[PDB]
Amino acid sequence: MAKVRIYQLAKELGMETQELLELLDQMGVAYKSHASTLEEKDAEAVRELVKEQRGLQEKLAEEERRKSLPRRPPVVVIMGHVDHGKTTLLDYLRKSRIAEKEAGGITQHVGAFEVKTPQGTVVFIDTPGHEAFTTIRQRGAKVADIAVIVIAADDGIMPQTEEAIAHAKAAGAKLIFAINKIDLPQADPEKVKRQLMERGFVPEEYGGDAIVIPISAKTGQGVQDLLEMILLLAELEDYRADPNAEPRGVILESKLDKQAGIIANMLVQEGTFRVGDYVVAGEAYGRIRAMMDADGNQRKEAGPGSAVQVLGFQELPHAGDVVEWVPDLEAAKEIAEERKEERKAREEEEKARAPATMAALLAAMAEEGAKELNLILRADTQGSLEAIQHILARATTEDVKINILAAQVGAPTESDVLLAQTANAAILAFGVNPPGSVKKKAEEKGVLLKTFRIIYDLVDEVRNMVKGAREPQYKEEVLGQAEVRAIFRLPTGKQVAGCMVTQGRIPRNAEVRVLRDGQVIWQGRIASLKRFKEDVREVAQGYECGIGLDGFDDFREGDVIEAFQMVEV
Template sequence: MKILIRWLYRAAFLLYDFSIMTNNETKNLIQRPPIVVVMGHVDHGKTQLLDYIRKTSVVEKEAGGITQHIGAYEITHKERKITFLDTPGHEAFSKIRARGAHVADIAVLVVAADEGVKPQTIEALGHIKKSELPFIVAINKIDKPNANPEKVKKELADNGVLLESWGGQISSVELSAKEGTKVEELLDLIGLLADVADLKADPNSDGRGVVIEARRDPRRGPTASLVVLDGTVKVGDYIAASSISGRVKALEDFLGKPVGSATFSSPALVIGLEDTPDVGAEFITSKEPITAAIKMAKQLGDFIEKTLEPEVKPNYVYAIVKGDVQSSVEALTDSLNKIKLENGAVKVLKSEAGDVNESDLKQALTTRAVVVAFNVKIDSAAQNMIRSLVASGSGHTINIVEGKIIYELLDSFKEKAEARLKPRATREELGRLDILAIFRQEKNRQVIGGKVAQGKAVKNTRVEVMRKDMVLGEGRITNLQQEKKDVSEVLEGKECGMVFEPGEPKIAAGDMLIFFKKLV
């Protein structure tokens, strides 16, 4: 479904591009800097390598001023620019790394000299080969006493990667990201591959590229990190990414400095979109509004989504996912959907960047969803709602798992989900009664009247109070009368009066009582 809708948006973009191309003159193509993605197994030194390159290639006072993470940064090596994608390393982020590979021109596959080829190494190779990316192998951690580069080369050969030193065509460098040994040689190789690829773009054309990060800033609203692949994005341009559109109000470079424009291969933060776009979404810009194609694709997408709505399955544990940035949200959602439960399945109802708010909690309360909060806060209105629920003594609770480590969040969610799906005492429904009138409400009891809509109303049984689709609480019917006579039960279609204990929750006309008995 999502793939189909994504292609509708892409088709709309292509139609829009075609209409522009027919009016444009021949492109003024010039050389553009390469975009590089660093990939490999967790703990093999990707982050350390990126950190070393950033610290040694960005002016020191500027590097110290980086206050935000926009998913990419730009360096200058021997008077030529190189853009590095700063993608997460944990296996839960494979989806984002795959998207990163599609954005990049060149990949660097990092393999630790002391550990060799690991599962994520093979996974990264798959992304690289699928994207047909030229790549370099960086054999890292050669400073380790148990480093064995030759073993790494053999394991790579066993997986179809033959390095130049073994008679193949893939360049490699043995380096130490910790000490900086031969990192400059790696940057030289990247420059060489970029020359061979002959990367070109037109600085005068409308901007186009890919969203690599997105988040909702409490002060500035939706923001998106972009990598420009062609053309130039300027403040004041109209912009669209999938179904999200807007106008560029402000641009910042990777250092957080305001800029008037961003051209090809540059990472930039854009402010002005009406909502947070999906990570991996393609974007286009124009000096004219980009609305017709987007609206057409959205209408088609909405129609297909409603027409092909999947069948609802039982035994779901619902989740509402909130995260600091869109890439974290997507990765967490992807991981939750992969969790295997013995007696059911996980269904993510909502996933978005931003703090947990009152709307999230209301949805969680009515659907019994678990709120999964990654590196975000619970806003003041939501905290007040939680305090009110506790103070009411209604027994209603909202399950929230929060933290800054994805492994722990997933473990906590699975624990709650398994507990919820465990076989436990069930109940037999006896009947349903519509509340027609409230005669008296006291501290410990309520005198009410209603009509049996289904089954029967039975004295001295437990009842559940329902308002629309929300369970307000439970109580017991201690007295039942029909035509002013005490009775033990009232059948379907008949009206009756009754005493409900306790005095909470407060019942109202239009509510429903469900009569039931528990079964062990």
């Protein structure tokens, strides 16, 4: 070295005499032979230009090794609010996956289910489901790369399905639309097409770009045409994911087993989880001690789009929080601690001006509320509790203001029966029933526990709780009762009888009843008005006067009177 012949430049590079001449003949470099000298500027202008061209020869190698992209997933979720004939879609695809026999093959509820065709795999999401808008958006995680949209022939595009489409969209997708119930009498797939077309979702028979398929979620019809098609659209939009790359999936839900201990159900989205790996989910970490699947088996491995029960985490990480791989316990702690530093700092931000802002109060429980009833909430479903909050913040009509304390997703527990004690509150659940112990604690402690099918059930039982005593009673049940005291058979009067009130008022503007020690005497209205002092036109607070009682005859001191109207008087 220090100096060079072009023949040595070639044995060093690992390039032909003529290749290196070809390189110099594109550069516009003057030369005599491969024994010629180069200039310091001209050998260095070869060295530097090689950095752009190598960086591109690896970009056109990462964008190609990333093209020959494996078997996938490529998940999908279906959308709207509760009692929507939306489980009914899921019901039908959860059975059309195994057309065959019982079973054998135990069909377990892993947050999802494989639907196994001739070229690969598509996994359909099996969970609530409604999403109920559990989170409106994560904003978000992208748990599934296809989304199968059901429009129901009985109901059509209820608003939750246009929000649902907007989760498929903003989650970076071309979209599949399923038309269920084509077998039912009142079924009009062309209304659905014109519903899709006034929204921009133009079908392929109208020269658009949004695929349509008539199917029956109870036959078995069009679910074939729907499967091949989902393989086509997977091809066309070219959504596949890697299986070697730093791992990624989603929690579907989390709970207990006597035998197993701490449990949670995980979709692996990307890469592979195995027994003995260390993991992180949310602020929660732990070691995979065991794995259990849909088919009830103990799993030595879980590959992409595997749903499983996982033994390993220290705390119970939340429904739809992402699970992620980490190099070491140091990363598992420090990642958990910055998200904890962020969410605690910001949750301290959030304290001010927050007793105000909203300004009811810190949900209203120190205003005289003039008929107060309270709540804490216990949903299954993050999407019910959003929907509940969206309904109820507007339903505050009759005087009482809804106070909604800190809430979660999943089943009842013994925390709710110590918060509802200290806050004097009601515990509202839907989808989810209370567990074993937890109803037996609640029902022997006097908290007004409730379960409902429809969120409209719950809210129209929240009405109840707007029973503000005096006015929503609406019974006309006696406006007063008054004991007789005397009567003036005075020859300057008529027939006025002292009466002492025992309800609201006795008025000159009012109807009259008379109730004996065993008999109804008589019924009518006030005609006269006389005191031992003067002929006054009203009596107010508890004072005495003589009133007149139509045609009567069982005079002087017979017994108590009972006058009624409306709250007017």
